[PDB]
Design a protein around this ligand. Structure first.
Ligand SMILES: OC[C@H]1O[C@@H](n2c[nH+]c3c2N=CN[C@H]3O)[C@H](O)[C@@H]1O
Ligand SMILES: [Zn+2]
Length: 349
């Protein structure tokens, strides 16, 4: 009984947020790097979230394990291959994985993430390494996987390079640019680096997606849409607070990348108020149902389906509808997007 035992499309999930506790454990020992536990189970309890934390609270969990992956070619390549494997088993036929190339490098990055020591794993190298892992998993498990590079809110110095990385690796997996991180940083959307990287994404035809409204007010969504030119909005739960904005976006067919479980666990969604996804569903909005960071929410793609099904009252007709909208809104080239639509319509028959 998996809520939606049919092909799915995932548009919103972070690679460094969907690693197997087993792989984390393996490289800790292998590199002699300290973890907060030496058992996959207790490692799941230190990293995982039980009840709602906050955004900065959730973001902190990465500290427990990122140091173990970063700077290790074998590790970056392996988590990528293993991610496809994970998604294949969830019955996902198309996925867009996102991650920050800088937070995994150890050379040519400033400031040095995780107190690393100069190495040879350059930000470019991590993109190439992940491509090889993703490509190898596509062949082995038979699914299509594409990737998105993330700009980090607190480091706009990195953004112009994320843009060049998206250009160099255009279609060689890289399909878009994301703006991720601590949304709570006042005006972090307007920082020049971010603004210029996005002005550049536009002139070079690089697809754009931006995390907004997960926790910030509607204005942050307005900045993403109007100033950064997002083609999609990660979360966007607060947009409904501005009926004007919302309705305008609704008429523009703006895609909202929803992650139900996630909103509850980051305190993004107050359990005492109707979920914005119920509105999106009811107004027939363009959106998708995503996992965001399974490792930290101790969740699976099914977790979210099961959630919208039990509470919120979603149905298979709706499940089928949103997955069709997710495919239409993918950052896939037309010919490939058509191919996806065909496949879903076939298996939905
Ligand atoms: O996945 C790349 C990075 O995006 C950030 N991230 C992960 N989950 C989220 C997030 N930023 C904002 N909201 C959340 O959906 C993390 O700092 C991780 O290192
Ligand atoms: Zn996210």
């Amino acid at each position: 009984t998996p809520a939606f035992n049919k092909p799915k499309v995932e548009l919103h999930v972070h690679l460094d947020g969907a690693i197997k506790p087993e792989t984390i454990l393996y490289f800790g020992k292998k590199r002699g790097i300290a973890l907060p536990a030496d058992t996959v189970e207790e490692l799941r309890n230190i990293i995982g979230m039980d009840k709602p934390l906050s955004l900065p609270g959730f973001l902190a969990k990465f500290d427990y394990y990122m140091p173990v992956i970063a700077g290790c070619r074998e590790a970056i390549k392996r988590i990528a291959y293993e991610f496809v494997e994970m998604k294949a088993k969830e019955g996902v036929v198309y996925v867009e994985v996102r991650y920050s190339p800088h937070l995994l490098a150890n050379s040519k990055v400033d400031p040095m993430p995780w107190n690393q020591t100069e190495g040879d794993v350059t930000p470019d190298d991590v993109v190439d390494l992940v491509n090889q892992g993703l490509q190898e998993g596509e062949q082995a498990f038979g699914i299509k996987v594409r990737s998105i590079l993330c700009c980090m809110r607190h480091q706009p110095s990195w953004s112009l390079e994320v843009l060049e990385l998206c250009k160099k690796y255009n279609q060689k997996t890289v399909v878009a640019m994301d703006l991720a991180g601590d949304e709570t940083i006042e005006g972090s959307s307007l920082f020049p680096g971010h603004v210029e990287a996005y002005e550049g994404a536009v002139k070079n035809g690089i697809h754009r997606t931006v995390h907004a409204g997960e926790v910030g007010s509607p204005e942050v969504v307005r900045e993403a849409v109007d100033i950064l030119k997002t083609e999609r909005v990660g979360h966007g739960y607060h947009t409904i607070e501005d009926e004007a904005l919302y309705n305008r976006l609704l008429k523009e067919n703006m895609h909202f990348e929803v992650c139900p479980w996630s909103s509850y666990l980051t305190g993004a969604w107050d359990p005492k108020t109707t979920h914005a996804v119920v509105r999106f569903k009811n107004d027939k909005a363009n959106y998708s149902l995503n996992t965001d960071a399974p490792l930290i929410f101790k969740s699976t793609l099914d977790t979210d389906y099961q959630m919208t099904k039990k509470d919120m009252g979603f149905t298979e007709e709706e499940f089928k509808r949103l997955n069709i909208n997710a495919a239409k809104s993918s950052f896939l080239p037309e010919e490939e997007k058509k191919e996806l639509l065909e496949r879903l319509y076939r298996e939905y028959q």
